[model samples]
Target: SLNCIVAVSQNMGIGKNGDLPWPPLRNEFRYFQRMTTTSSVEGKQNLVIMGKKTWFSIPEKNRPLKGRINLVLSRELKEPPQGAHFLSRSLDDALKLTEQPELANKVDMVWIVGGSSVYKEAMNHPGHLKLFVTRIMQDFESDTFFPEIDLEKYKLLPEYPGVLSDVQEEKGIKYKFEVYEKND
Candidate 1:
């Protein structure tokens, strides 16, 4: 399965100057970690894909992203970053890695942790693609933004298991946790 996870503000802003633009929301960040690292079996790794800039946005001390297999999309990078497992040229190539004989069993899901281009491709990825969106109620000044989600193709769920479906607050900024699955 392929999925996208993101947190955006009222204007659909996701980042600015290579990092998250919104105020630090501890719970939101933790929620992202939980979703990306989770897998079907212990010790098996879930695969997380992201663009090169997004890959570098993380502090060096946390390069490999800990529990998950960090796959970075970079056409310019000749070598994988310090901790990244693979340097993917594109999202399609990253998905292919999940199906390779040696990795198939070990990779439980494909999670696209992104920049705008990566998210755009993930939305068009074949098979089931769910969008896990954290909608911040306030607007923020941002140079980077998220792609549009088409309502006709994705149905927003009012409630979902293992997801906090109501309004949440952090540093006085209110946000809503939402999950959208492709229409069957």
Candidate 2:
């Protein structure tokens, strides 16, 4: 599912670091990387965007996310990293990059995977990500995190794979998938 996912449930919540809740990271670390890979985003020439830190922090094994094209955001990246396409000099630049031929034609889905700052940037777009939040508790330590979403601005979507599929590993994580769109 390039621009979509195949879960039976929706868990919309912020995974917190310090006091800020930015739960999307949870997917990248424990699930999404694997989930997206196994589901549909992988093995195809899909597209994803991340901050330099998010891109670099990933394990070498998952570096390219199988088939999807990886894009990174930075102030100045002389060249797109090994697999990523370099995005705008700023958030405006990055989002703006999406409309280009490379992004418009080649990339079907654009995931704003990132460091907190990048997520914030994407969040502000007029209509960028179809936000999916999975609210749950994660016992970890970090200084940076995803920004919070306004509950009033979001309407509950759905939770999928209400139970993790046997295809995936079940750990301490308990989640429900959720989908949100800009309030029309």
Candidate 3:
């Protein structure tokens, strides 16, 4: 399966400067940790594909996203960085990693996480696509945004598999987890 996990504000803003515009949503963060870490089978791993900037944005110590294959998309990188396990010139190229004979058994899903262009590409790409969004109910000052969901092409569901289906509150902010899946 292929999916995306992102946090967006009412304005669809995901970040201000380089980090989230709102205070860390602990439970939401935990949800991300859970979704990306949970594999269908024991000893298998998922793939987290993100842009080079997103890879760099993660704190040095917490990266390679722990229990998943950290694949980065960038044309400038000639080799994988210190923490990233793989580097692809484009999003299409990154998906190819899952096809490697050695990785076929180890990789369970392809997860596209962050930087606008990567998200847009995955949403429009062929095949089924799942979007896990952390909806921040208020507006935030941000320079980065997630791509708008074209309702004509996709549908947002009231509930999604493996996701907690509930509206949650934190630090005086109202937010909810939502899932969008491609239609037809």
Kindly list the per-residue Cα lDDT of model 1 for residues 55-149, writing each as its tens digit.
88888988889988889999889989888999988777778878898888788877888987788778777667889999999999998888888
Q: 97 in model 2: Cα distance from truth in Å?
A: 2.5
What's the TM-score of each model vs. the native? 0.94, 0.66, 0.93
Can you write out model 2's per-residue Cα lDDT over 1-184, one digit (the tens) per residue?
2222222222222234323343343443555554443334343345666678768777777776665566677787777778665655676665577677765655455565555666666666664346644434444444444465566665545444432422332365454545665543
Worst 10 residues of 2 by lDDT: 1-10
Looking at candidate 1, the ten consecutive residues that score lowest on lDDT are 120-129
Clashing pairs in 1: none
In candidate 3 the C-alpha lDDT for residue 6 amounts to 90
Query: For model 3, where is the 10-residue window of minimal lDDT?
Result: 158-167
Q: Model 1 misses residue 134 by how many Å?
A: 0.5
